[PDB]
């Protein structure tokens, strides 16, 4: 009649009822947590899942990942047919002995936008930054008649332009040199390189899986932004994916401001998730919770 499992890695069943709790809240929330697949099927030092059932149906879920020193995200969804209930709370209680175990202090949540502000606002979370999962469904390529820039692949003797960009554009980085080196001997990766003038101004990275291929890290130094480079150095690098046979390409926009994203929509990418973020120490949420 009621059941809690707490494991350290979600089976192929499990992952599959847990998706369609997801898929449930998506329809009635707008939106979910984020959850982090490859984590959650991973056997984890420790475990970070918990699963409630009532009579043979998955009501709730929680999974914890240990990102950080003397904080955790939490990704934790309840069906919208059984809210108020305490299901959360009773997924709450349930993992903090491991929160405990490993000194948190302070949790971060992740959310679907707009449906909790007011009782986070009044329980005294802070929003701290929002998190954008992007798709390009269609197979329709960019058309660009006027190209502006030479887009080659990145080499081990572009080390240290990469490095330059990466200091330039992403602050929130910082030992880039072994990373690169790891990227760029490793098949699964393709960085491309933009030059203007035979002047190297920006990067961007796909990471190429099955079915999927992923772009992330772009990057266009600040004396050369806002000219369309990097428009175009996206747009080059969907088309180079759609020739190379994946069905999805994604990306993720981490920002407070949707501003942002109007370099992704602009070509063809969709809102497929949006979440928020928030924090509170954990004292706290012990005491508003009981
Ligand atoms: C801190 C966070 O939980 S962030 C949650 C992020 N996840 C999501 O938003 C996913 C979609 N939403 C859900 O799945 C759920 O509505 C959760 C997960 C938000 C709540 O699950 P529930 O099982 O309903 O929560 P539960 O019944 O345990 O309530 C715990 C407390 O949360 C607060 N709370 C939960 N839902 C609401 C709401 N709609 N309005 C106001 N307060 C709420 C209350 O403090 C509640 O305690 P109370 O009933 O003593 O006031
Ligand atoms: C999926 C991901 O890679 S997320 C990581 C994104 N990269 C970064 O945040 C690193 C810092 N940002 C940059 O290097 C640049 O701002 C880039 C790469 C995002 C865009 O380079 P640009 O050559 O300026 O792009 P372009 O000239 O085609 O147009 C800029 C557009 O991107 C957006 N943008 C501008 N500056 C930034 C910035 N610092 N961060 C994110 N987006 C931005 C704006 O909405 C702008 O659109 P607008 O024409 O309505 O103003």
Redesign the pocket.
Known sequence: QGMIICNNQIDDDQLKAIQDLASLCREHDGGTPTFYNHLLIQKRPTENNVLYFQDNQLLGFLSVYFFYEDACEVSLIVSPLHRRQGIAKQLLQTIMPLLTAKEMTTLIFSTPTEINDDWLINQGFSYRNSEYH?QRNGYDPIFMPTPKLHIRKATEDDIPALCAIDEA??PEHQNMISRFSMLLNDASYTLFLASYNHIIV?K?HIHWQSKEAI????????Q??????????LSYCINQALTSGKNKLM?????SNQ??????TRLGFKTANVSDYWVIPLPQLLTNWA
């Open positions: 992007m554009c992403f920006g961007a772009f992330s890290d772009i990057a266009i130094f600040p050369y932004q806002g000219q369309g480079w990097g428009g175009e150095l990306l993720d926009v981490e920002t501003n942002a994203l109007h370099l992704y």
